[PDB]
Amino acid sequence: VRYCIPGERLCNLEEGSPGSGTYTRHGYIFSSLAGCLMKSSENGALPVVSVVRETESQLLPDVGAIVTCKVSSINSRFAKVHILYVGSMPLKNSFRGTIRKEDVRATEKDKVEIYKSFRPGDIVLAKVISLGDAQSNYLLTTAENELGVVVAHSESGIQMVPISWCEMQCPKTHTKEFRKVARV
Amino acid sequence: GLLTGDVQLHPEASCLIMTTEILRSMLYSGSDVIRDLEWVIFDEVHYINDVERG
Amino acid sequence: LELLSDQGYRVDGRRAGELRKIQARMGVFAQADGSAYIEQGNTKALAVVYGPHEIRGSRARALPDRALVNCQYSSATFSTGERKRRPHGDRKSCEMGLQLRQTFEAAILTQLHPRSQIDIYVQVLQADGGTYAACVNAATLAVLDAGIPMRDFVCACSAGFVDGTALADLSHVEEAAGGPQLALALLPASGQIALLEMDARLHEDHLERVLEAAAQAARDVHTLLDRVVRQHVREASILLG
Amino acid sequence: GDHRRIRGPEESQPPQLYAADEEEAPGTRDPTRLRPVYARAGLLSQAKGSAYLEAGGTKVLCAVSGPRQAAALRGRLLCDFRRAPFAGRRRRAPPGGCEERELALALQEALEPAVRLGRYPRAQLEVSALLLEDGGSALAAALTAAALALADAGVEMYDLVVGCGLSLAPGPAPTWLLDPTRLEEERAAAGLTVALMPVLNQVAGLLGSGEGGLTESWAEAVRLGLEGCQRLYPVLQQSLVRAARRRGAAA
Amino acid sequence: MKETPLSNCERRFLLRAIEEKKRLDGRQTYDYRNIRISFGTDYGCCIVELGKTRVLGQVSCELVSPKLNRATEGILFFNLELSQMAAPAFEPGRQSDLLVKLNRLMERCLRNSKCIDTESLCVVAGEKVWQIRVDLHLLNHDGNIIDAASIAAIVALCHFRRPDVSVQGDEVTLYTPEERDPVPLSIHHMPICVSFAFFQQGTYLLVDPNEREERVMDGLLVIAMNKHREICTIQSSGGIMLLKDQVLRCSKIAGVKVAEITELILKALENDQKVRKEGGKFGFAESIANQRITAFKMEKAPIDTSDVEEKAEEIIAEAEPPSEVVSTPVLWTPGTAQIGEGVENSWGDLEDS
Amino acid sequence: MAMEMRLPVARKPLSERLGRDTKKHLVVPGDTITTDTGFMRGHGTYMGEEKLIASVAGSVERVNKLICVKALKTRYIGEVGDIVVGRITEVQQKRWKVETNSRLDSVLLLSSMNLPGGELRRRSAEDELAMRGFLQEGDLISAEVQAVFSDGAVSLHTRSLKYGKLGQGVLVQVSPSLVKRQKTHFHDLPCGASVILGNNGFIWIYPTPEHKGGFIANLEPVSLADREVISRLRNCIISLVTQRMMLYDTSILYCYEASLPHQIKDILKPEIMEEIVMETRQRLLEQEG
Amino acid sequence: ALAARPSAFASTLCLRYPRTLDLYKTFLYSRQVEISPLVAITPFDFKSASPDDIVKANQKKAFTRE
Amino acid sequence: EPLEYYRRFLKENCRPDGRELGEFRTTTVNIGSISTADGSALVKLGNTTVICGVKAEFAAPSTDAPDKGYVVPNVDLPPLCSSRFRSGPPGEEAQVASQFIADVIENSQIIQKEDLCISPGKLVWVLYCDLICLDYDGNILDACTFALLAALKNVQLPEVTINEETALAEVNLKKKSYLNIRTHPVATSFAVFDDTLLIVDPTGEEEHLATGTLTIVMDEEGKLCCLHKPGGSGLTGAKLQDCMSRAVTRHKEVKKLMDEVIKSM
Amino acid sequence: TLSEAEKVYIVHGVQEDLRVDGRGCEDYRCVEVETDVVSNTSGSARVKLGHTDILVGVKAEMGTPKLEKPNEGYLEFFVDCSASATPEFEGRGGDDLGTEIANTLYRIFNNKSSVDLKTLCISPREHCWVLYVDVLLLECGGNLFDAISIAVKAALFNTRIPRVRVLEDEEGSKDIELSDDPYDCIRLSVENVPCIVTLCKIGYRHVVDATLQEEACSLASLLVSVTSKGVVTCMRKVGKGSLDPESIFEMMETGKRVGKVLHASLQSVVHKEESLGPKRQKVGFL
């Protein structure tokens, strides 16, 4: 196996096609990273050549991506969060976010009180929809059955467990609280 | 929504029911409601012969 | 050193109640929204203003009742005998520009531009004598060039007191002599004062006479600048038609 | 003086201005030689990308931080150049210097023609370079190292940046020299530094000032600078290969 | 953080009062809030309280070389500062358009009036001369910061006492309060500021306004005028448009008021000197009100220093001695040595080549 | 090529070159205008104590109860049914921000915009994501003012076929008081190009759209014979706008015809402009008179 | 274009820092130092109504509006 | 999760570094590499790299005691060593890391300013020692101190002789002398967990989760110079006496390091 | 900023040797240089290349020679950027641009043969003349480098340097004695003071004197410093795009020719302005 530097001659436009993290010019395929040479033959010949480091220290979010987050503060009409994991991998730094009062449920309905949906200190799974404005930058959404708070935390520091679609109960003191439970 | 002169209820509803002069009032201006209109139906067409409102 | 001879003539040859020669101009720059240029005696000033615009930064620093006047001051490094270069952190420029912001927050009829900024810039190319009144008059002319409405035509002049007499339009030689200097900012129609300054000691009996001589010298500046404005407006009316 | 540092003497004249040993004579050499260079990538552990470049009497350390929050539709590229006080004949003021800002801008206008910022909307990259020792051509090291750091940190660029340096002899028959040293740089009349992309064959940055006024010397200075940037490339070719072989084998 | 906002009921309440010519705390138009001075123990230190405002003044001198030109005088720094505790709003770098006008008011008053005698503060010329440096701090903001700051600076400067020196031939010597007695200063006059506020477009005025009255006012007029009958500075500011009879009325008012204030200051300094000379006890400590719940007094107390030897001895004796695994240093090549678990090979070589 | 270097010349005041006396009434701030029993203040004046005091330099214009002063330098003020031209400077969640030389910014609502397709297909929240894609930063539109807000702000709409994003051409910015009010601000001058005389001071010059909303890019080379016409109109517009002349179709056509004899590159001199402005002045005098 | 061999400063700057009986005794951890839960169902397997899905399929199938 | 995960290793008595909770990292140094400085030394502590450099200049003695030569330390934390430092004026951590070294230099009396004067009252030597951190992993005040002490053992000054009629300074650059060093202060840092656990040689993550920190520096004759406790949980006399027993061994280790590297030249 | 369609139209026009003003790919708009505008200084200039506006001033003062060489003076530049030129230049914000221009000017003038250095020393190791060049940006309308490198040669041509004949002898009056004549000065021999020439690249063609709109459509540029004799002093590449080796060689010829014509025509205009002296009055800012 051989690795790459972000430019070299790899293949012709007839002997394959550019993939992820590559660019082409003057009929040749040129590398754009320092990772490893992977050629996904797939099916139909003409492999889509690409270079991937496979050791992601940082990765910029996209228009559509699954991210694991951590709520920082909540407001009556929005809830600022902190992106913590981009899908699976840990993130070296922390960006910022904002959950508007339209992305809680998968219907974009009225009612939907934000206060009992995203209590601070939780960890949530959400999806981006846009690159946002200068006030709110990523505009995450949870309008799905698989998205929502996944691992909550008690009032007095005890790991929580899901109990229903809309209601949660304390295991120790048997206290009832409201969340937005996501599918496991 | 009801856009009658003396009763105004839900002016942003999907379906608006109004007297005729309101339609010309919102047709003189833009009002950004003509873009999302699919059907416009008239209930009494026999006022073309009206001597003062035709 | 003699600052007033027995005959009554000053160092430069003018009497007590005599002004210097002013030579103005309207419409100096093209890119900006207003301009002016005045040379009061041997002091050369310059002023540039920018019209009501969107507030820079948009950091929620607006006033919902009036506009935001923002005036700066700068000075060329060859404006006096010695070089005397200064950084843009000196407290003399900030305090003079703060008195400028104070007098133009009172002269301009500002409750007509909600959520708007007014940027006023003044540049002094050669300073010899009263700098404050030259900057005020140059920025009044630049604001007039920009078409900004105001209650009246604010004008400023200084005065002094040597050997029992009141001077007018003091110079740098006379200023750097330890005397009771004093400056106003007058609205000619009402006689009101927008700003008052003084320094060094002076007995209370001669304050009325120094203030009156300063107000009269400001009313004398008013006529001379008024003829310049009238000639400019008649010029543009002639140009139009 | 400064309220955020330890205050010592108000004035301090270094002993070089009292050094009674008269300035010596540099010597002579062959102008068709290059100082051997050793390059290492991935040095620092807490930095997203880093590189350390040393050749002869030059010591420069470069580290690259990852993208952070805050021509958009495009990302910025912040830069910061700073050299160690214990470098050169005399000490330097910690607060800064106009020379540092000029070289920082001469770096910024040279590493942006390589990376493609049309892939990082609303983000920004920050690059920090430090010179531990000044023993020759410096701007030919702050370019190579800050490009190696970028390549080992996994940001997407069109190509690398390889720098060189030259100087003009002061004799009656001046001739340009390659990789000058402080003994051959403080006695020179002019200097030139080029930034060439070796594959794309495009000059990235140019800077030169001095006493050479005939437009026939600068053609050779430029083209021998291009030959230097095409001769330094293989070492940087094997350096990133070893860097990636070790990083991948570390998993 | 910011300051509580102003309602629309307080404005109305202050203005119906002011129209009717009666104020909240009872004092009529031409009155001051009574004053209360307190002296430290080392010279040039005082605490003035005007109403409920506090300022701390402290003078201090030091010996430097006198620039170039003006070889036979001394310099006089000043630095006003506004303490975060004066009021919620004051913030170290977010109130930079009051500091300037305040420092300026203070400096123009104190340094242009020529009341301090900076002539006779030299030791040699071209050589070391005394450089005094006044310092004031605002502690509690309740309106009229500048009157209190001026009275504070006056008292602090009229209570200082320098060191003193012997100069004869070409030889210096520096004494100390035991070798030679500290010496007072020379003060020609006492310039004291006064402020006036104007209400609803100059129709009414109020002497010595506080901070609420300060938020319902158009503009301010300050008139600094030393003793005798000699005015020293005036500075109209704020939002005011003034007449000419009014400046004269104000000058009269400042004359009267500065007369009374100078009476008070002179009496207080004399009483303080009398106390210091009688031989009684002075200082910040013997100023705390004793008829008040928040003061308590305790003479000295040996606590019991009878046991510390025993405790220390048993503690030192009762703990584990240093252990005895000693480590070895490894030598690679002169210049570099390593201690710890070490590295396997002698040094890396051709690891990847 | 010689890089001519002339020397500055002192300006001649009073406009003695033609000679006219004004019959108007001129005022300056502080002057007391007529103070009869009952009058209404206009824009440019204010009231003191039983006095109508002018507050800006200009000439009084009264229509039958109304004293007002018309200044000669102001910023654009919005009015209903006024053609404007602007540029996008901010793209927000539900709006754009457009700069049109006014005291504030102008808002283009998403509800009023001819989306690609030009017919009734749909309008929902899916379009909100791509609205910030096509109307990006620094683009040119040509819309019509809808209404006046409560703080001098203006809302402008694009509900027609002639309005929308513009294409190739050149832009010339002048003061927003030299454009003459008319009923047709769109022109198709018989020279080889067109023009839009924006009432806010934006002059846009573009070639004629061959035969026959921003849907078409048409980023193909423009013929040589069209650039020379656009450059000629650009220089002529600068020439007419500078000294006094009020701008409209006939003045530009007249100067364009007057500009044929000598080259387009050489007209930047103070005197060639004068010999063209005077010729247009006298041609207008012998045609209108 | 010959590459060269390192020197002390570089070979020490590039250092990778990656039971065997007991030492440093005092610094061990042992020497220095009812819950009846009645837990509910452990997860909630969502086997039940999940309103969003209800309202969507409800209206689409229903398709009556009367 | 955060606290419990680490306490799993604490109860296991083997922290994730692979250490027995009472041992230090691997230590290595080099001296004499920067040839543009009077003296320099590089200190590596299994990351936490710190480099120091010494430059000697001339300066006027102070007005009070004109027989002293100044020594000025400074510690700088550039935004490249870590990712939490931002550009601009020096921050609180580097300023405290400089005030601590200044206090150590003063209290320890390692050098005497009377040994630097050439002619009393006119000119005195001045030493500018600036520390720049190449890597921040934890225990900053230990490696900065060791870098400074190692550097001060290599700085060498030339013999300067002043004329009488000329009264200038003629530097003899051939015969170069050394510096007189009295003591050898070495610091040691402890990190205290929630209320009872103390560890040696902590790490940035551990300091991120710890609740206190203690630093102790010892002479070569068992004398304490400073007792730096920024604050936290709280300790007892027995725990301090336990810490000093380890610090004695650490000091013997370090003093053996310095006693061995200098002999090797 | 300008839209993408405007940039496409402009680049196509440049490729067709047509521009929005009407000039060609190498034409140069006129300028209005003048001298002797400021009184208190010892030399002045005022360059107007278009919407831009420059004003400089040179003051000669007494000083001390530097350590490296005693028979020399030195030059100090300070390019101020007044905030009246543009509102975003308010207070802080014009510092980086001023430093960029000052360092470039220092690199231009950092040579032994720039004008002279023997003339500015009077007593070795004890005294020398110092020159204060004070640039003041009044307006910005593009091509600022050439509009400043022209006002610097212009102001340098108008220096006075009042002659001082004071004897340095200790027995004599060592303290500097002037000539006491208020109108006794000496010229400066500025014949070969270099100037900067900018060459913006758009498409695959290079354009002289690009406007702000034409500058926004360009990706790179090169600066050349050429004297009247035709020699190069400094060479700095500024821009945001690559350039290619060939275009350097084909831009050097245009830089040489434009520099030679610029220098010859500036010598001709300055001699024309100087041929008639106290006549012709002086008009500026009024």
Short mmCIF file of N, CA, C and O in Angstrom, two decimals, chain D residues 4-9 11-15 18-21 44-47 59 61 63 80 82 85-89 91 128 130 132-134 182, chain H residues 34-36 47 51 53-59 72-74 76 79-81 83 87 89-90 95 126 128 130 134-137 169 171 173-174:
data_model
loop_
_atom_site.label_atom_id
_atom_site.label_comp_id
_atom_site.label_asym_id
_atom_site.label_seq_id
_atom_site.Cartn_x
_atom_site.Cartn_y
_atom_site.Cartn_z
N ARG D 4 2.28 44.58 32.38
CA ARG D 4 2.01 43.15 32.25
C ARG D 4 3.28 42.32 32.17
O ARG D 4 3.24 41.16 31.75
N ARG D 5 4.42 42.89 32.57
CA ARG D 5 5.70 42.20 32.52
C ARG D 5 6.54 42.64 33.71
O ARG D 5 6.15 43.49 34.51
N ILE D 6 7.72 42.03 33.83
CA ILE D 6 8.66 42.33 34.90
C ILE D 6 9.56 43.47 34.43
O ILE D 6 10.19 43.38 33.37
N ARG D 7 9.62 44.54 35.21
CA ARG D 7 10.34 45.74 34.82
C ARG D 7 11.78 45.65 35.31
O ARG D 7 12.02 45.35 36.48
N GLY D 8 12.72 45.91 34.41
CA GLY D 8 14.12 45.95 34.76
C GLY D 8 14.74 47.32 34.54
O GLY D 8 14.16 48.35 34.91
N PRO D 9 15.93 47.35 33.95
CA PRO D 9 16.55 48.63 33.63
C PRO D 9 15.77 49.36 32.55
O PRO D 9 15.17 48.76 31.66
N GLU D 11 17.11 51.51 30.31
CA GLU D 11 17.91 51.46 29.10
C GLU D 11 19.01 50.42 29.26
O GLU D 11 19.50 50.17 30.37
N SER D 12 19.40 49.81 28.14
CA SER D 12 20.41 48.75 28.18
C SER D 12 21.09 48.67 26.83
O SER D 12 20.48 48.23 25.85
N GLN D 13 22.36 49.09 26.77
CA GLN D 13 23.13 49.04 25.54
C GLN D 13 23.88 47.71 25.47
O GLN D 13 24.65 47.40 26.39
N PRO D 14 23.68 46.91 24.42
CA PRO D 14 24.35 45.61 24.36
C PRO D 14 25.84 45.78 24.16
O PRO D 14 26.30 46.80 23.60
N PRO D 15 26.65 44.80 24.58
CA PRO D 15 28.11 44.92 24.42
C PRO D 15 28.62 44.78 22.99
O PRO D 15 29.83 44.97 22.78
N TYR D 18 30.08 47.92 21.98
CA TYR D 18 31.39 48.09 22.61
C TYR D 18 32.36 46.97 22.25
O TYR D 18 33.49 46.96 22.77
N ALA D 19 31.96 46.02 21.40
CA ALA D 19 32.83 44.90 21.04
C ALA D 19 34.06 45.40 20.29
O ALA D 19 33.95 45.89 19.16
N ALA D 20 35.23 45.26 20.90
CA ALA D 20 36.47 45.78 20.33
C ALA D 20 37.08 44.88 19.27
O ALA D 20 38.11 45.23 18.70
N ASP D 21 36.47 43.73 18.98
CA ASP D 21 36.93 42.84 17.92
C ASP D 21 36.32 43.31 16.60
O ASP D 21 35.10 43.27 16.43
N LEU D 44 4.82 18.21 17.49
CA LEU D 44 4.05 18.48 18.69
C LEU D 44 2.90 17.48 18.78
O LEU D 44 2.38 17.00 17.77
N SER D 45 2.49 17.18 20.01
CA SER D 45 1.41 16.23 20.25
C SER D 45 0.05 16.88 20.47
O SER D 45 -0.97 16.29 20.09
N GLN D 46 0.00 18.06 21.08
CA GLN D 46 -1.24 18.77 21.36
C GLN D 46 -1.69 19.69 20.24
O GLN D 46 -2.74 20.33 20.36
N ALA D 47 -0.95 19.76 19.14
CA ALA D 47 -1.32 20.60 18.02
C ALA D 47 -1.92 19.72 16.94
O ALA D 47 -1.51 18.57 16.74
N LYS D 59 16.78 27.67 12.68
CA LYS D 59 15.93 26.83 13.50
C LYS D 59 14.55 27.47 13.55
O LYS D 59 14.39 28.55 14.13
N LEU D 61 10.24 26.55 14.10
CA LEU D 61 9.22 25.60 14.53
C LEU D 61 7.86 26.15 14.12
O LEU D 61 7.53 27.30 14.46
N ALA D 63 3.58 25.35 13.93
CA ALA D 63 2.44 24.55 14.37
C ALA D 63 1.16 25.14 13.79
O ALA D 63 1.04 26.35 13.62
N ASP D 80 0.38 34.56 12.09
CA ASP D 80 1.11 35.20 13.18
C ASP D 80 2.56 34.76 13.09
O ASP D 80 2.86 33.57 13.24
N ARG D 82 6.43 35.29 14.64
CA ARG D 82 7.15 35.76 15.81
C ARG D 82 8.44 34.97 15.93
O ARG D 82 8.45 33.76 15.72
N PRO D 85 13.48 35.89 21.03
CA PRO D 85 14.40 36.99 21.37
C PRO D 85 15.85 36.57 21.33
O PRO D 85 16.71 37.39 20.96
N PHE D 86 16.17 35.34 21.71
CA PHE D 86 17.54 34.86 21.69
C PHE D 86 17.96 34.38 20.31
O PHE D 86 18.42 33.25 20.14
N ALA D 87 17.80 35.24 19.31
CA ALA D 87 18.18 34.94 17.94
C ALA D 87 18.82 36.19 17.36
O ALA D 87 18.26 37.28 17.47
N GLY D 88 19.99 36.03 16.75
CA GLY D 88 20.68 37.17 16.17
C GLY D 88 21.68 37.81 17.10
O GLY D 88 21.93 37.38 18.23
N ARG D 89 22.27 38.90 16.60
CA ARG D 89 23.32 39.59 17.32
C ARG D 89 22.79 40.24 18.60
O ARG D 89 23.44 40.17 19.65
N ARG D 91 19.28 41.54 21.23
CA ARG D 91 17.97 41.20 21.76
C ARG D 91 16.89 41.98 21.02
O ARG D 91 17.16 42.96 20.33
N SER D 128 0.88 29.63 13.28
CA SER D 128 1.88 30.26 14.12
C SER D 128 3.24 29.66 13.79
O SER D 128 3.39 28.44 13.75
N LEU D 130 7.57 30.07 14.62
CA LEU D 130 8.56 30.60 15.54
C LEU D 130 9.96 30.25 15.05
O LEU D 130 10.22 29.12 14.65
N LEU D 132 13.65 29.86 16.19
CA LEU D 132 14.51 29.72 17.37
C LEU D 132 15.90 30.29 17.13
O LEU D 132 16.53 30.76 18.08
N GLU D 133 16.37 30.28 15.89
CA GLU D 133 17.72 30.76 15.59
C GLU D 133 17.76 31.26 14.15
O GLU D 133 17.19 30.65 13.25
N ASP D 134 18.45 32.38 13.95
CA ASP D 134 18.62 33.00 12.64
C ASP D 134 20.07 32.81 12.20
O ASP D 134 20.98 33.51 12.67
N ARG D 182 24.46 34.47 7.55
CA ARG D 182 24.61 35.79 8.15
C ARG D 182 25.95 36.41 7.82
O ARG D 182 26.06 37.64 7.68
N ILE H 34 21.80 26.62 21.18
CA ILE H 34 21.60 27.93 20.55
C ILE H 34 22.89 28.72 20.69
O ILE H 34 23.31 29.06 21.80
N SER H 35 23.53 29.02 19.56
CA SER H 35 24.84 29.65 19.57
C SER H 35 24.77 31.17 19.46
O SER H 35 25.82 31.82 19.40
N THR H 36 23.57 31.74 19.42
CA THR H 36 23.39 33.18 19.41
C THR H 36 23.05 33.73 20.80
O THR H 36 22.72 34.91 20.92
N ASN H 47 6.76 15.31 27.17
CA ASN H 47 5.96 16.49 26.87
C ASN H 47 6.26 17.55 27.93
O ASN H 47 7.15 17.35 28.76
N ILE H 51 12.08 25.86 27.02
CA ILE H 51 13.43 26.26 26.61
C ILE H 51 13.72 27.64 27.19
O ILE H 51 12.84 28.50 27.23
N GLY H 53 16.83 30.90 27.57
CA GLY H 53 17.99 31.54 26.99
C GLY H 53 18.45 32.75 27.78
O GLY H 53 17.63 33.44 28.39
N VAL H 54 19.76 32.98 27.87
CA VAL H 54 20.31 34.04 28.70
C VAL H 54 21.10 34.98 27.81
O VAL H 54 21.93 34.53 27.01
N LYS H 55 20.84 36.28 27.94
CA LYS H 55 21.61 37.31 27.25
C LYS H 55 22.10 38.33 28.27
O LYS H 55 21.33 38.76 29.13
N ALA H 56 23.36 38.72 28.16
CA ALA H 56 23.98 39.65 29.10
C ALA H 56 24.23 40.98 28.40
O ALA H 56 24.76 41.01 27.29
N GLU H 57 23.85 42.07 29.07
CA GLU H 57 24.00 43.42 28.52
C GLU H 57 24.51 44.33 29.62
O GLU H 57 24.74 43.90 30.76
N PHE H 58 24.68 45.60 29.30
CA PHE H 58 25.10 46.60 30.27
C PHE H 58 23.95 47.51 30.64
O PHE H 58 23.06 47.79 29.83
N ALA H 59 23.97 47.99 31.89
CA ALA H 59 22.92 48.88 32.37
C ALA H 59 23.45 49.69 33.54
O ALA H 59 24.45 49.32 34.17
N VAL H 72 16.35 39.73 35.08
CA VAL H 72 14.92 39.86 34.80
C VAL H 72 14.40 38.59 34.13
O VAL H 72 14.76 38.31 32.98
N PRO H 73 13.57 37.80 34.81
CA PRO H 73 12.94 36.65 34.16
C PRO H 73 11.59 36.97 33.55
O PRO H 73 10.86 37.85 34.01
N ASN H 74 11.26 36.24 32.49
CA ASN H 74 9.95 36.35 31.86
C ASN H 74 9.56 34.99 31.29
O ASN H 74 10.39 34.31 30.69
N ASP H 76 6.73 33.15 28.79
CA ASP H 76 5.77 33.40 27.73
C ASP H 76 5.12 32.10 27.28
O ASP H 76 5.80 31.07 27.16
N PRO H 79 0.52 30.98 21.53
CA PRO H 79 -0.69 30.23 21.19
C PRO H 79 -0.43 28.96 20.39
O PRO H 79 -1.37 28.32 19.93
N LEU H 80 0.84 28.59 20.22
CA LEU H 80 1.16 27.36 19.50
C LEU H 80 1.46 26.19 20.42
O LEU H 80 1.29 25.04 20.00
N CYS H 81 1.91 26.44 21.65
CA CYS H 81 2.16 25.35 22.58
C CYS H 81 0.86 24.63 22.94
O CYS H 81 0.82 23.40 23.02
N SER H 83 -3.83 25.11 22.71
CA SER H 83 -4.91 25.62 21.87
C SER H 83 -5.87 26.53 22.62
O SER H 83 -6.83 27.01 22.03
N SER H 87 -3.84 35.08 20.94
CA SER H 87 -2.82 36.08 20.66
C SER H 87 -3.15 37.39 21.38
O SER H 87 -4.30 37.68 21.71
N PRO H 89 -1.61 40.45 24.37
CA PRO H 89 -0.74 40.61 25.54
C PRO H 89 -0.70 39.33 26.35
O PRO H 89 -1.61 38.50 26.26
N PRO H 90 0.36 39.13 27.14
CA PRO H 90 0.48 37.88 27.91
C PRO H 90 -0.68 37.71 28.87
O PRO H 90 -1.19 38.68 29.44
N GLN H 95 1.90 35.19 33.19
CA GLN H 95 2.33 36.20 34.14
C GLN H 95 2.58 35.58 35.51
O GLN H 95 3.55 35.93 36.19
N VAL H 126 23.43 43.11 33.18
CA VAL H 126 22.02 42.75 33.28
C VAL H 126 21.77 41.47 32.50
O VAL H 126 22.25 41.33 31.36
N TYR H 128 19.00 38.83 30.91
CA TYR H 128 17.64 38.72 30.41
C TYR H 128 17.36 37.26 30.10
O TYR H 128 17.80 36.74 29.06
N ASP H 130 14.50 34.67 29.28
CA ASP H 130 13.14 34.59 28.75
C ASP H 130 12.83 33.12 28.50
O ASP H 130 13.62 32.42 27.85
N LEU H 134 7.26 25.19 24.74
CA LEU H 134 7.02 24.53 23.47
C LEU H 134 5.88 23.52 23.55
O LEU H 134 5.37 23.10 22.50
N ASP H 135 5.46 23.14 24.75
CA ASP H 135 4.41 22.15 24.92
C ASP H 135 3.86 22.21 26.34
O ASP H 135 4.63 22.18 27.30
N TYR H 136 2.54 22.35 26.47
CA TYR H 136 1.89 22.45 27.77
C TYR H 136 1.14 21.15 28.06
O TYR H 136 0.06 20.93 27.51
N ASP H 137 1.68 20.31 28.94
CA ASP H 137 0.97 19.11 29.36
C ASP H 137 0.61 19.09 30.84
O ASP H 137 -0.28 18.34 31.23
N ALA H 169 34.99 50.79 28.00
CA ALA H 169 35.04 49.37 28.33
C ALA H 169 35.62 48.60 27.15
O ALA H 169 35.11 48.69 26.03
N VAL H 171 36.31 44.82 25.98
CA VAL H 171 35.91 43.45 26.28
C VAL H 171 36.98 42.49 25.76
O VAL H 171 37.37 42.54 24.59
N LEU H 173 37.38 39.12 24.68
CA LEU H 173 36.51 38.04 24.24
C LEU H 173 37.18 36.67 24.25
O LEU H 173 36.50 35.67 23.99
N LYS H 174 38.48 36.59 24.54
CA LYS H 174 39.15 35.29 24.53
C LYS H 174 39.04 34.57 25.87
O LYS H 174 38.63 33.40 25.92
#
